[PDB]
Amino acid sequence: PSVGFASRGSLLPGKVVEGLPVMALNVNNVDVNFFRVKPESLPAFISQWEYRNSLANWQSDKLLQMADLVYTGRFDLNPARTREKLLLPLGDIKPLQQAGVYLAVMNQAGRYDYSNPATLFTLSDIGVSAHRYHNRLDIFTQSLENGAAQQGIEVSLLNEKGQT
Amino acid sequence: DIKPLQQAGVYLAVMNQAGRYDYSNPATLFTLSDIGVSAHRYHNRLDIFTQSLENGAAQQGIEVSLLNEKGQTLTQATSDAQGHVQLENDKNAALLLARKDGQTTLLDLKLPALDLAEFNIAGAPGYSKQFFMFGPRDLYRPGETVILNGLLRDADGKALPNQPIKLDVIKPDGQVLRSVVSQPENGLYHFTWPLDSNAATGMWHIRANTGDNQYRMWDFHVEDFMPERMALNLTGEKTPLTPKDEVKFSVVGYYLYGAPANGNTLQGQLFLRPLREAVSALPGFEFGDIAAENLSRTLDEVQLTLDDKGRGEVSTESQWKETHSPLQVIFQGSLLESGGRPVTRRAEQAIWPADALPGIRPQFASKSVYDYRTDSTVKQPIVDEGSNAAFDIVYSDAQGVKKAVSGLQVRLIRERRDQKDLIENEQTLDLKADETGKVSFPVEWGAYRLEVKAPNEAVSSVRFWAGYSWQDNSDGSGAVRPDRVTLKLDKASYRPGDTIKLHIAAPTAGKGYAMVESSEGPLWWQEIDVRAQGLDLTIPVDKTWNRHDLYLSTLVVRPGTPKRAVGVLHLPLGDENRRLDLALETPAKMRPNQPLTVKIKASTKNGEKPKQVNVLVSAVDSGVLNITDYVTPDPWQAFFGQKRYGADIYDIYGQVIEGGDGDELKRGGKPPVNHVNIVVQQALPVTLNEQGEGSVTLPIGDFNGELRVMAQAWTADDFGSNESKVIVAAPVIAELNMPRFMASGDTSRLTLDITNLTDKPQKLNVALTASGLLEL
Amino acid sequence: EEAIALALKTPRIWLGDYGSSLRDNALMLSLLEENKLLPDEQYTLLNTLSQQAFGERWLSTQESNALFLAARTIQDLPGKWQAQTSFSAEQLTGEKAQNSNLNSDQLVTLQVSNSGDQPLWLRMDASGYPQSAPLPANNVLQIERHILGTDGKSKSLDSLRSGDLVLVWLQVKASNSVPDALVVDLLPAGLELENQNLANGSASLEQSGGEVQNLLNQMQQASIKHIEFRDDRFVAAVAVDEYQPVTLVYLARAVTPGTYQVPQPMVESMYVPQWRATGAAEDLLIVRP
Amino acid sequence: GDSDEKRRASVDIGISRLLQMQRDNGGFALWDKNGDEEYWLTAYVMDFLVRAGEQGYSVPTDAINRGNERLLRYLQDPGMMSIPYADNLKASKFAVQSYAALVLARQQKAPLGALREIWEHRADAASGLPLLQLGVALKTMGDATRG
Ligand SMILES: [Cl-]
Ligand SMILES: [Cl-]
Ligand SMILES: [Cl-]
């Protein structure tokens, strides 16, 4: 009688998307809520979130105060009684196609629990590989799947306060 | 537009903000239905009355799902004009539900029944065969013989066959001392047994079992008392004083042997206390400012001497002239003997800041909540945090009649947790005469106080806490109180041959029912209409109604939500021809060590046939009877007096949505013997002759005081009771006042009062000597 | 035999042995029983255990374990008993505990013999006034008395006048639980109790005790079985323990003028009469006219 | 620490709060004016409030007088003190009276008769502090020898 995020990763590719992987057992309908993290003071969010598997109800007030809700989507599944993992169609969600780091908090339709499965993610087929030195930093932009789209102007380097 | 919610069953709505995650989310239990049931619970059955909200009284009722503690339906059927239902009642019954597909109405028996505190539904619970337990007194000393008499009759005071009644003697600890099987002698039960000298002190009782296994109690005190030798009367004023008035108490003291308390000292205490329960006609309604300071004080210590007539006056100037709350002055007066032993009594004087005051009654329960600021658990009216708090507000006089007023300052104050009292909300209330104002305020958390101020400056306030309830609830402290329907009757008493004419004066119009009830069920199952401002209706009193627990009831509803109102009134069937005119002829004054003669004369107008009248004569010292203000046992009031209302009313109009032995004395030491004299006499039951005449001679010993002559009379249905006061006094009284005991090596100033009660001057010599463990 | 004899004379993480006096006394009992040695010492430990279990608020798992193992075999024996006594020409027999009241003639010549085939258990409790007033003493229990005026101040026991109301304050303490403490406060002959059970004919404790509300609140918290307002004494049946001292307050009146001896306040256990205390000796009580 | 402005504002808040814990007899309770009296803490808070006055803070005159009246009851009447949880009741009573004595003496309000009678029970002390407080009180009120 459970359903949770299986990958627990920070980046899903824009290409070969297949949404977010979720492992479920006897759960037919799942209500997932998506929140776009405020671009300003984003390092303060990552340090508070610490890339968790679930979200506590009391600690949610401080963390979700720097993230705005964009969509409230329920998803239809068909398991009756094996703990098979499945996809999540995200391609039809227009606000998620916009820039920014997102947080998905899923729960069973009419279930009320202490903690609900949550994950921090970004939908992108871009793969950077930075190199840190005593004075400078050289970044190498690329692309996932067949292709190495190297062009890189788009480099937002933010400090501890959360300013580029 | 929600199709699954249009189906039968009880629902629960849990709401939350789209993407919010909190510890608790708002939730409510509800049922969508325009059906309004009103059940009536009885000892064996349960009669339910189905109806409808808005304009319409759709009475048809087949749809009655009565579920038990497990959750299984027991019975479901239909009956009577337009619709009604009669079902079998269970001791552990829990639910009641309405309709299969046409909506659902929830009514649970677990919730408290409607509070009928404003109605006179009080009386004896003896709806079954009546057993009147009586004796000459209710106060005994350890080592005394307890005297108890009894007469067994049916529900209508008629004689029944000779049956044994099992009597148990119960101790204050609840343990039985002795069990007997009482057999009657000439229709009279008589139980006598001696209290041990090592007997426990407190409230003892004799419990009787007629066979119904529903015990009949006879309470008696067992205490180390001293009979009073003086009478003390402390009188204030019936009508409350204004805050400017001086408080005055009139004192009267006299020796019960018939002489004033001339020169006797009266020591006492004057106290100022708040008068929160200022209107007895409105039980539960609080009056005055609970936030007001210095309302509980010790005013003065009273020290005075009574005049030659045994008279005095106690007064204190007002020190609460600017009060906005009703107060009371209590005088705890002690009239002292020449030896120092007092006769203490209390008198209270009501003080009202105006002629009419505002009163508040919370509609929510009072639960025992611990307060660490006072380090003591105290029961206080509590309501759930984030919920509305309901209150009944009335502008009443001392008598209870609600007066018309406009401009009541209804203010919701939030009391400081850890600056000053924060005024949360303000209101303006207009009241009509005989109208109960109903205010509801949205409450957050912590300490709160609801205050109402009248234009005459009179302030009334009630404190209430907002938070959690960890069970520990007061037995039905949050019960629904219905609006009152003043019911009026044409005659003071009715009989099987009479016809009752009842005037139903409801606050507004409304359909429902009008009936006559008993503890076994109703007798006038239906009557439905009410129109305009009042309704005079005829009720034919039936001949088979042979009981005195019979009451009348009405119910009215009107939509704007459909406000419900209830009316209840006792139906008197006690006939005056069933009472014996018992006359007692005793001398007003008599001498000690002489026999007292009581001349009995039983009669009744038109009839005048006192056929084989039995009389039980007794004589007890008044100083014994005054300690517990003992009432002479009346057999007529016992068998025919107003019995309690045998029904319980349940309705859903309050939940409609709007928008070893002697071992302790051995360890302490053998107590000294107290040689006080208890003057109690009970002669055998005599038979009055053809004329209804008879005489009883009671031997009176060395007693100086007042004696109460008491008599009880009976036949098969005729009952009588009378009393007379006989002063027993010598020409010259010589009485010694001494401590209750003395210890070895003590010195006591004894006092001997020599009183000349002759019209002639007396010259006497008093020769004193001491024997035993006493020396002069 | 030297070690065993020394053990039964030796009294009792901290020590690390998870022990207590109660536990150790029950384990020592089982050891003696198990090894069928010193049966007279077994009976001594059994009586000592009965009083310690009675005076213990809560028992640890090891205490109840040890107590159960030491007493599981005593109820497995029949309750039948036979005795030949000094106060009976006929033999006394029963299947349960049968009490027999005795007077001073019987008690001074009291002799009991076992005429049974099993051991009999006897309990003898004798009570009465001593020839002279003993000195204040205390064991397990403690009692103190103080008299206040209705103004909440200490009352000057000389400046007492006929008619005065006084508040008599008792404080009872205990070094262990006393579930059945009996407080007997014998009155001076000049003081009469304001019988609270007969409210109409007496002064109210509630009304006259507003200046000692702390004491009334403390008294409301006490576990009181009953309170008796007798002619010569105030009596209270209460439960007391080390973490919960008992406060009692009663209203009395100065009645007969005179000079009175003041009896000391007393408290004792019904089950363990050795748990007893007599409070400090007071000055004579003078009631003025 | 605090700024001088914050520190002074906090003392004023504390005084007004403490005054709401003063009972009708002048003694102080733990949280409310209706709670049970706290004997040692009444001397403690009275010490605080008198010293607060010498340090430039306002305390109402009626509250100080009521407090001092109650401290005088402690010197005169140790017998009415209910301290049921005290292991050494006489030592507790002695610490209360000695503290009460110092607070009144620092205001020249401690009667020498009462101080001399507390001094007769000096053997009841379980610490040096109550004796040093009583000593300063006796010296201040005029008995330099016993002081
Ligand atoms: Cl007198
Ligand atoms: Cl074993
Ligand atoms: Cl016992």
From Swiss-Prot, chain A:
Member of which family?
Answer: Belongs to the protease inhibitor I39 (alpha-2-macroglobulin) family. Bacterial alpha-2-macroglobulin subfamily.
User: What does the record note on quaternary structure?
Assistant: May form homooligomers.
An additional note in the Swiss-Prot or TrEMBL entry is: Bacterial alpha-2-macroglobulins were probably acquired one or more times by horizontal gene transfer from metazoan hosts.
Q: Which domain of life is it from?
A: Bacteria
According to its record, what is known about the domains?
A: Cleavage causes major structural rearrangement of more than half the 13-domain structure from a native to a compact induced form.
Localization terms from the record: Cell inner membrane
> Which species does this protein come from?
Escherichia coli (strain K12)
Range covered out of full length:
166 to 330 of 1653
Indicate what this protein is called per its UniProt record. Answer: Alpha-2-macroglobulin
Job of this protein: Protects the bacterial cell from host peptidases. Acts by a 'trapping' mechanism. Cleavage of the bait-region domain by host peptidases leads to a global conformational change, which results in entrapment of the host peptidase and activation of the thioester bond that covalently binds the attacking host peptidase. Trapped peptidases are still active except against very large substrates. May protect the entire periplam, including the lipoproteins anchored to the periplasmic side of the outer membrane, against intruding endopeptidases.
